[PDB]
Amino acid sequence: MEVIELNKCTSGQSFEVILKPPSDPSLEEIQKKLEAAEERRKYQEAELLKHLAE
Amino acid sequence: MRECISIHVGQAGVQIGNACWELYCLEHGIQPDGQMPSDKTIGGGDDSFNTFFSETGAGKHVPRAVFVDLEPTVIDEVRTGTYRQLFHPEQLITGKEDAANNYARGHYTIGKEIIDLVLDRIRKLADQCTGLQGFLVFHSFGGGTGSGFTSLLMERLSVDYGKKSKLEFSIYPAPQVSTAVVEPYNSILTTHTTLEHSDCAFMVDNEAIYDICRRNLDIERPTYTNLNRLISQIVSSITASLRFDGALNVDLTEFQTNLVPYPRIHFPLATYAPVISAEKAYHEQLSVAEITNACFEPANQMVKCDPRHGKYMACCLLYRGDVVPKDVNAAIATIKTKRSIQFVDWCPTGFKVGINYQPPTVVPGGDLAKVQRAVCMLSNTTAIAEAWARLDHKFDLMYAKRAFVHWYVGEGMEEGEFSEAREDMAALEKDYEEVGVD
Amino acid sequence: MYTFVVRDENSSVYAEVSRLLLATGQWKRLRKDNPRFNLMLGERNRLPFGRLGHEPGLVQLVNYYRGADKLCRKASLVKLIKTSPELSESCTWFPESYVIYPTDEREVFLAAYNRRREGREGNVWIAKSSGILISSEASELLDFIDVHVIQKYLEKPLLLEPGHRKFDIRSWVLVDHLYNIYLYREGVLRTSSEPYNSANFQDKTCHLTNHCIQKEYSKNYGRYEEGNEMFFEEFNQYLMDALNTTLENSILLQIKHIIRSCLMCIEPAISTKHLHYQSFQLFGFDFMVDEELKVWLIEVNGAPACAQKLYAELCQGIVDVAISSVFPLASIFIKLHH
Amino acid sequence: MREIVHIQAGQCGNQIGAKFWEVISDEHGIDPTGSYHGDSDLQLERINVYYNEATGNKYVPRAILVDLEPGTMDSVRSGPFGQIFRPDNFVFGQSGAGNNWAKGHYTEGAELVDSVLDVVRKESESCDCLQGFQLTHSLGGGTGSGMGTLLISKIREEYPDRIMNTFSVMPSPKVSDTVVEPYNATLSVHQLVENTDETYCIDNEALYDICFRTLKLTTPTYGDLNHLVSATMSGVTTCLRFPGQLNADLRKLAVNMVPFPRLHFFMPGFAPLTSQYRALTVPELTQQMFDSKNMMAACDPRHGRYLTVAAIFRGRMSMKEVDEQMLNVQNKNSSYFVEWIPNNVKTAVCDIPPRGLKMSATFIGNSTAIQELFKRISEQFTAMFRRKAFLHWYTGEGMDEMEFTEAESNMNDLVSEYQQYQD
Numbered sequence A: 001m002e003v004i005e006l007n008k009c010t011s012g013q014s015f016e017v018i019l020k021p022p023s024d025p026s027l028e029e030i031q032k033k034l035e036a037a038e039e040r041r042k043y044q045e046a047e048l049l050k051h052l053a054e
Numbered sequence B: 001m002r003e004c005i006s007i008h009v010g011q012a013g014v015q016i017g018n019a020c021w022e023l024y025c026l027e028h029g030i031q032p033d034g035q036m037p038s039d040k041t042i043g044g045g046d047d048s049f050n051t052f053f054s055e056t057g058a059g060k061h062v063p064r065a066v067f068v069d070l071e072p073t074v075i076d077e078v079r080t081g082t083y084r085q086l087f088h089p090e091q092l093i094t095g096k097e098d099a100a101n102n103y104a105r106g107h108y109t110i111g112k113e114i115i116d117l118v119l120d121r122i123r124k125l126a127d128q129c130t131g132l133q134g135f136l137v138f139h140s141f142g143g144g145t146g147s148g149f150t151s152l153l154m155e156r157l158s159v160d161y162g163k164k165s166k167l168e169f170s171i172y173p174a175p176q177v178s179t180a181v182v183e184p185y186n187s188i189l190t191t192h193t194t195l196e197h198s199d200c201a202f203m204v205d206n207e208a209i210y211d212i213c214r215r216n217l218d219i220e221r222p223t224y225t226n227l228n229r230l231i232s233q234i235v236s237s238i239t240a241s242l243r244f245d246g247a248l249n250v251d252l253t254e255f256q257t258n259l260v261p262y263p264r265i266h267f268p269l270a271t272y273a274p275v276i277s278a279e280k281a282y283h284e285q286l287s288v289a290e291i292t293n294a295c296f297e298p299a300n301q302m303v304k305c306d307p308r309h310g311k312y313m314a315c316c317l318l319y320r321g322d323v324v325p326k327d328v329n330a331a332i333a334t335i336k337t338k339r340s341i342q343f344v345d346w347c348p349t350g351f352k353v354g355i356n357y358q359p360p361t362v363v364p365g366g367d368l369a370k371v372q373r374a375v376c377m378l379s380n381t382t383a384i385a386e387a388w389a390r391l392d393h394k395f396d397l398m399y400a401k402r403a404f405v406h407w408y409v410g411e412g413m414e415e416g417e418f419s420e421a422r423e424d425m426a427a428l429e430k431d432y433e434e435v436g437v438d
Numbered sequence C: 001m002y003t004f005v006v007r008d009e010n011s012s013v014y015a016e017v018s019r020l021l022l023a024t025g026q027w028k029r030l031r032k033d034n035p036r037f038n039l040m041l042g043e044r045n046r047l048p049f050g051r052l053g054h055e056p057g058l059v060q061l062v063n064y065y066r067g068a069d070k071l072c073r074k075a076s077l078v079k080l081i082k083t084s085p086e087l088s089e090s091c092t093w094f095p096e097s098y099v100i101y102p103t104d105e106r107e108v109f110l111a112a113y114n115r116r117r118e119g120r121e122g123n124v125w126i127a128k129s130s131g132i133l134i135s136s137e138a139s140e141l142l143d144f145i146d147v148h149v150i151q152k153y154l155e156k157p158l159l160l161e162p163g164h165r166k167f168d169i170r171s172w173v174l175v176d177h178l179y180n181i182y183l184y185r186e187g188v189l190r191t192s193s194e195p196y197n198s199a200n201f202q203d204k205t206c207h208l209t210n211h212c213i214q215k216e217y218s219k220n221y222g223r224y225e226e227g228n229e230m231f232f233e234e235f236n237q238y239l240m241d242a243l244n245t246t247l248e249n250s251i252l253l254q255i256k257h258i259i260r261s262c263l264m265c266i267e268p269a270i271s272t273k274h275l276h277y278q279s280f281q282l283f284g285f286d287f288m289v290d291e292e293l294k295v296w297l298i299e300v301n302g303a304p305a306c307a308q309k310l311y312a313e314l315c316q317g318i319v320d321v322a323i324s325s326v327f328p329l330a331s332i333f334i335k336l337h338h
Numbered sequence D: 001m002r003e004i005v006h007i008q009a010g011q012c013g014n015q016i017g018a019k020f021w022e023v024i025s026d027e028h029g030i031d032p033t034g035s036y037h038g039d040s041d042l043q044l045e046r047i048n049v050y051y052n053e054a055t056g057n058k059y060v061p062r063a064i065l066v067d068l069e070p071g072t073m074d075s076v077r078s079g080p081f082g083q084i085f086r087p088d089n090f091v092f093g094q095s096g097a098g099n100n101w102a103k104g105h106y107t108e109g110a111e112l113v114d115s116v117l118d119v120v121r122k123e124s125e126s127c128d129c130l131q132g133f134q135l136t137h138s139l140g141g142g143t144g145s146g147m148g149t150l151l152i153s154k155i156r157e158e159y160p161d162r163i164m165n166t167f168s169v170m171p172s173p174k175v176s177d178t179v180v181e182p183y184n185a186t187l188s189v190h191q192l193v194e195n196t197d198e199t200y201c202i203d204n205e206a207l208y209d210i211c212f213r214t215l216k217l218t219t220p221t222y223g224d225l226n227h228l229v230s231a232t233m234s235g236v237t238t239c240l241r242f243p244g245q246l247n248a249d250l251r252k253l254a255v256n257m258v259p260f261p262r263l264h265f266f267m268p269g270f271a272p273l274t275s276q277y278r279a280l281t282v283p284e285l286t287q288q289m290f291d292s293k294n295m296m297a298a299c300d301p302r303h304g305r306y307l308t309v310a311a312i313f314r315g316r317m318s319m320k321e322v323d324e325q326m327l328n329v330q331n332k333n334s335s336y337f338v339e340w341i342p343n344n345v346k347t348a349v350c351d352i353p354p355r356g357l358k359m360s361a362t363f364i365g366n367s368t369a370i371q372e373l374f375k376r377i378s379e380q381f382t383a384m385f386r387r388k389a390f391l392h393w394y395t396g397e398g399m400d401e402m403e404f405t406e407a408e409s410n411m412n413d414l415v416s417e418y419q420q421y422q423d
């Protein structure tokens, strides 16, 4: 066991114990997919209203 | 001093956030009206606690937090809660109708109409920060808002705050308290969309918190209040390093550096001890060795799984109370020769230890008993993949029949996003098995 | 009404256990993929342990210990015995073995192979994995491998008379959810009908005691005992008449010692004491006995079959100590304490 | 505040709807004059879901009463709580519908539907956030069945993004008024398959058997049948009217109960059903709640499989014991719950029990056995349609035989769709 990097302060302390050594999408792209989903909702509602109009 | 902004999404995120900020105030001596007697610098300062609280000219310490919910009833309790005086209206954001446990409804339909408002409010807090570290995002996996809107907020946050770090406190769905049959859908959909935008995520399984409350607190039927009190203790021990003087996990970047070498594997397992019922006058105070040994018992983990059949990539021990390094090393030596602890070949077999002398604070009259010392272990073990496997199995069962899929397509989501998200989880399970199995 | 599922249709031991559970009127069998079960007679490979213990209101028990493969795989067993301090490296009940890949122990295997050859000691080794080869030339063994294990072939085995024939001992051990180690009171010797010939190792009918090989490649199958299976009652009588000793004193003490040692070694790694699900498992230990009445451990089977005459008694014992202990309804074992 | 707009149409719909408002009004502490006299704030916390508040702290049910005859609506206005309904919300004609779906849907009903929608619009406009509609009606008559489904189609057109929920009374030869009820019911079911998100199938055959066999009522009346419907309607709406976590609004209920858009027909159940001061233990509530004898649809649940289930326990009881009994029912009868919808059974508990009971349980199941109800109607329909019997009542109103053939085919499809998921 090796204890390293011991830091002490008035409110506590920290250290490391070693037991063994080793061996994004853009704003435009987001708005498109949000608008794409909104358009698929508009289309599905349009088909409903067309169905109801019949 | 660098600031951290907390964001609470959905019922789970808001109610948990409400419990955490109540605990913070108790820990920092901040009265419900916002006044902090021990704070001698009036109207300003750059102390450790200022990373979570700003200050007004009148001496009010205001949390750097934003509460977002698509339904007003949950946040309204914050507006009329004991700590209503801490927050001001700009911090609390509510909608008219919620996502109805529908990821697509919260992400696309409702998310598109309220995202700009949330970001604008977040921008307000960012403008107050001289050096913003990043964000802590509280939310559930199963809720329509917690899953759907969070994933949208995380995408945008990466756009507006590219250099900032983002940490998650995610509530993993458990049927004993769950409220929707489709929560596996929302869990996998939001994990897929958020995976590349989260630097470190702490999953809390309601099943584990539920059984811990029943087993160790003698709660017959634990409520959200019981669960959130215990969750706030875990969250507090994790964020204490950011709110107090210390050297371990002093900024958000350090969480990734100390716990996440493999970016996709950013889900550390949390183990907490001890949890003692307050209904008993005297309880034999557990020692450093005993509470440290408890960190390797599955019954104390935030996610039930078996680390023995896995590998560790990193392990942090966060102590609060009467603890000195000598006792920690002595307990580790004993535990090391009695436990099955295996690290990956390419990682050192060791522990990063942090000790805060102030013992844990408990809500007066709550269910948790005051203890002389507590510990929270943060270990990145491949065994946490067991939670993914369970979730993915339930996803596969319903999706094979397309059960409930029409609710999501009806919100504008394409059926392909389901398989796309499921294929990502499959790759994730494969990454874990490669790292921790021979 | 307890519920259970069946996920290993090829298990003869648990097909009988299943039949008994149903015959009690208090157990109900579900579809293999139904999650609301109390007991799982799971599959041998890729048993989803990670999906157990997450059903509210159900005490769940499975018939396999996760991680027991370390003991039931030849390469794993060799690595386990060598590296585990509890078993050390100089444990006298396991033949010197080396793991050879087609890390690796090729160079170490030849090191000890030379020391014996120089000293004129017997260099007859056997190679096998999870078809074998028995040779006195290390070069022929390695060529045969091109994962495998190379252990010292016991050249001085205890030979049953009449017949001058080899044999092996099979012991069934049941470990319940509390990690009580139960050794079945009944064992079986799997004998070789052909006389042992240390001259020609290629004729492996007399060298391999496997029940399948004896019935397929041997002419004297079933000459001395029915199915080349000698039970403990007869074997004990033989030891008393020929060697003036008992099965308990000469062999059984060493067997119990070996069983305790192996199972206690892995107990920390596989125990379900404080786990959200409980496990039990039936193991099959195979031993060799040399002419000095010393017992050697060959391997450990995690999914063993039972002797035909013993299915009834053993399968009932599994239900009594392993299943009914967790799910009570409305001894044939020797408890190896520890 | 997620408001619901209630609609009751026809004789059956208005008599069952009236009893419903009488029941929940008592629960929420509202008297016949709209004044609240309760003793618990839980009564008013979600009172706005079903009631508007007028000047003087008066609560007015958000209910619209519709019929093509004035008869039954005159009885309602003279009934116990008749004075509590908004007078402008009485919309009625004079001709009637003569138990004729065509008259309610195409002729007599078309002439009156616009004035009903005008009242619906006035109610919706004063809703902070209208969440949907609930309609009470029968399928065997003319107004509730024919004009009811017409109203639903026109409500969906004007409010396509709102939830539509119905309590639909299915006809039965045991309790029949005319022989054309299979025709009216078959035509209406297809409308419901397309234009409702949630339909509680209330089978008059089951209501009668429960009154005759269980309740020991030798000569059951419509009042007796409606007593069971009031209790069931109060139970299934408990999660909407009181604070809770599960199925707290119409949309979340649909997401939990409807895995496929067309299979949204539920089997309601109630317990206890006593012929009365004895306390009913939680185990007893649970076993009775799942007993077919407590089902309101006249279908044997053991003849199919449960897709989803919603249970509501009312009264002061041990929630730990509720969970144990619910888990006991599923784990002991797991074969009747489809395995491809994990944890498809959800439980809720409300502290306020119904009037006259210390404890109660309401069952809401989406079972594939409901096909037995639609098969029954399909057989009776075909028995007459193969000979075109009684069709002149409908062709005299402009309908063509093809529309009957299509309604028949549509309901057989629904039966086949249930059968495919039962396997």
Ligand SMILES: Nc1nc2c(ncn2[C@@H]2O[C@H](COP(=O)(O)OP(=O)(O)OP(=O)(O)O)[C@@H](O)[C@H]2O)c(=O)[nH]1
Residues within 6 Å of the ligand: B009, B010, B011, B012, B013, B015, B016, B069, B070, B098, B099, B100, B101, B102, B106, B140, B141, B142, B143, B144, B145, B146, B147, B171, B172, B173, B174, B177, B178, B179, B180, B183, B206, B224, B225, B227, B228, B231
């Ligand atoms: N631990 C804990 N879990 C909660 C709490 N509230 C809700 N949950 C869990 O969150 C999941 C449901 O998500 P919610 O947060 O309630 O839903 P939401 O985020 O508000 O999104 P909506 O669908 O629009 O309501 C369920 O699995 C609940 O068990 C809480 O206060 N504490």
Ligand SMILES: Nc1ncnc2c1ncn2[C@@H]1O[C@H](COP(=O)(O)OP(=O)(O)CP(=O)(O)O)[C@@H](O)[C@H]1O
Residues within 6 Å of the ligand: C095, C126, C128, C151, C152, C153, C154, C155, C167, C168, C207, C208, C209, C210, C286, C288, C298, C299, C301
């Ligand atoms: N080191 C050794 N010395 C002498 N004989 C040996 C030996 N190793 C193996 N044998 C012989 O080989 C036979 C079968 O070997 P082994 O058990 O490794 O293969 P196996 O796994 O196919 C049979 P089982 O699964 O029942 O144990 C044994 O019955 C034994 O007689």
Ligand SMILES: Nc1nc2c(ncn2[C@@H]2O[C@H](COP(=O)(O)OP(=O)(O)O)[C@@H](O)[C@H]2O)c(=O)[nH]1
Residues within 6 Å of the ligand: D009, D010, D011, D012, D013, D015, D016, D097, D098, D099, D100, D138, D139, D140, D141, D142, D143, D144, D145, D169, D170, D171, D172, D175, D176, D177, D181, D204, D207, D222, D223, D225, D226, D229
């Ligand atoms: N449960 C119940 N069923 C009724 C009642 N009145 C009529 N019915 C049933 O409804 C059908 C007749 O429809 P009805 O409402 O009278 O026709 P409408 O007024 O034109 O809509 C028949 O199947 C009756 O059995 C009632 O008060 N209660």
Ligand SMILES: [Ca+2]
Residues within 6 Å of the ligand: B039, B040, B041, B042, B043, B044, B045, B046, B055
């Ligand atoms: Ca200050």
Ligand SMILES: [Ca+2]
Residues within 6 Å of the ligand: A024, B158, B162, B196, B197
């Ligand atoms: Ca980023």
Ligand SMILES: [Mg+2]
Residues within 6 Å of the ligand: B010, B011, B071, B098, B143, B145
């Ligand atoms: Mg919500």
Ligand SMILES: [Mg+2]
Residues within 6 Å of the ligand: C299, C301
């Ligand atoms: Mg073998």
Ligand SMILES: [Mg+2]
Residues within 6 Å of the ligand: D011, D012, D141, D177
């Ligand atoms: Mg009538």
